[PDB]
Design a protein around this ligand. Structure first.
Ligand SMILES: NC(=O)c1ccc(O)cc1
Ligand SMILES: NC(=O)c1ccc(O)cc1
Length: 328
């Protein structure tokens, strides 16, 4: 009869109760600013959906970041704009300062606050035990905020976390894959970067929720505490699941796919094999041992679960003994 349905265990009906104006991004009307207020300085990067530039707001002389949307992006731009406006002011959420029409591309350009020329992947393999804990807690603030607001990020990775290490300031960026959670809705599984893709995405389970971001955060943590970039290093999306299975075991994988009445892609029969769950202590060595504690291991264990429903939520994660040492 097909897959068994699933719902988020928290913030289930936040959008259902809200006026349509909140989540119906298609019907959102954009208030355009002055493109001439911003002077492009240097290109930072280019992807499939945008080109990001460092800029100067010539009115106040402040450094800003301009994200010029590619035309590929059509009316998915609307979703990002709405999400960024809904989440503005939220803890560690990138602040959207303006929306201008780019003269060259003839597409919207999103103007953000400038954090630093530094991402989390530039720093994260170099942090102390205390800093891992500190920055993980800052990330959780952003995640609980967007989840509480009916939004799932769907692209949590070190590259999407902008840090000003000197000022101990953090921002969750690139809401281009973000979506409104609607209970019972089937979503596109082609979201997030390969190494941070949850087992739900890899086994083609479309009724996923906020807990997807929690798996992605677990991938980040594992990578930080064990000094392994990335932690689950798949050659592609199939080998990605095999890499996970080599650590968590194939038995809990079969229990997961059984519970949700999911049919695994036949391609997995030849490559998945049989694996016992590995104890987290197996990944400990003299080079990462100062970052590993029984608290770190128990916390990681409660994020990296196949069953998306059995993962800690962002709020439960903030309550964890792992964060008791972080000054609050
Ligand atoms: N697609 C995107 O929005 C994007 C922008 C900059 C990158 O460096 C990578 C990706
Ligand atoms: N601080 C930065 O370099 C930065 C990068 C990308 C953003 O979308 C926002 C800010």
């Amino acid at each position: 009869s097909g897959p068994v349905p699933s719902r988020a265990r928290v913030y289930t009906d936040v959008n259902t109760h809200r006026p349509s104006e909140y989540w119906d991004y298609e019907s959102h009307v954009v208030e355009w600013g002055n493109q001439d207020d911003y002077q492009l300085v240097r290109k930072l990067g280019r992807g499939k959906y945008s080109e990001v530039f460092e800029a100067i707001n010539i009115t106040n002389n402040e450094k800003v970041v301009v994200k010029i949307l590619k035309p590929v992006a059509a009316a998915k731009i609307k979703r990002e704009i709405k999400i960024l406006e809904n989440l503005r002011g939220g803890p560690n959420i990138i602040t959207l300062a303006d929306i201008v029409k780019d003269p060259v591309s003839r597409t919207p350009a999103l103007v953000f606050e400038h954090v630093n020329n530094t991402d989390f992947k530039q720093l994260y393999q170099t942090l102390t035990d205390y800093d891992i804990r500190f920055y993980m807690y800052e990330i959780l603030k952003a995640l609980d905020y967007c989840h509480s607001m009916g939004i799932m990020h769907r692209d949590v990775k070190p590259h999407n976390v902008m840090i000003d290490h000197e000022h101990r300031k953090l921002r969750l960026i690139d809401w281009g894959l973000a979506e409104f959670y609607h209970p019972g809705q089937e979503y596109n599984v082609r979201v997030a970067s390969r190494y941070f893709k949850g087992p739900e995405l890899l086994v083609d389970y479309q009724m996923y929720d906020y807990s997807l971001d929690m798996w992605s955060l677990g991938c980040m943590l594992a990578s930080m505490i064990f000094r392994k970039e990335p932690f689950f290093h798949g050659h592609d999306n199939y080998d990605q699941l095999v890499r996970i299975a080599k650590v968590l075991g194939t038995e809990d994988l079969y229990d997961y796919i059984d519970k949700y009445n999911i049919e695994l892609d036949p391609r997995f029969n030849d490559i998945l094999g049989r694996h016992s769950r590995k104890r987290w202590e197996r990944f400990v060595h003299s080079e990462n041992q100062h970052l590993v504690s029984p608290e770190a291991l128990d916390f990681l264990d409660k994020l990296l679960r196949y069953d998306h429903q059995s993962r800690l939520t962002a709020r439960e994660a903030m309550e964890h003994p792992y964060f008791y040492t972080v000054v609050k």
